[PDB]
C-alpha cells in the first residue's frame, strides 16, 4: 500500500496531537543541565 500527500499530512497531524513538548522543555531546564557553556 502507498501513501500520498493528503493522507500523509493527516498522519503527521495525528502524530502531533499526541505528543507533549512542555515536559521536554522543562527537562532541558533541569538542575543537571542549566548552565551549559
Amino acid at each position: 500500500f502507498r501513501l500520498y500527500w493528503d493522507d500523509l499530512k493527516r498522519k503527521l497531524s495525528e502524530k502531533l496531537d499526541s505528543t507533549d513538548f512542555t515536559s521536554t522543555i522543562k527537562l532541558l531546564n533541569e538542575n543537571s543541565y542549566v548552565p551549559r557553556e
Binding site: K26, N29, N31, V34
Partner: protein
C-alpha cells in the same frame, strides 16, 4: 521548580551587593584619613 529558576538572578544581585559594600569600606578608611587631614590643617592654621 520556580525557586530553582530564580537562582541566576539572585546570585548575581547578591554578588553585586558584596562588591558595593567593599567599596563602602574603602570610602570609610578614606573618610577617616580625611578627618585626620582636617585636624592637622586645623592645628596648622592655629600655628600661622
Amino acid at each position: 521548580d520556580s525557586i530553582s529558576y530564580s537562582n541566576f538572578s539572585v546570585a548575581e544581585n547578591f554578588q553585586k551587593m558584596k562588591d558595593y559594600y567593599k567599596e563602602i569600606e574603602k570610602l570609610k578608611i578614606k573618610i577617616l584619613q580625611l578627618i585626620e587631614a582636617i585636624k592637622k590643617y586645623q592645628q596648622h592654621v592655629e600655628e600661622l
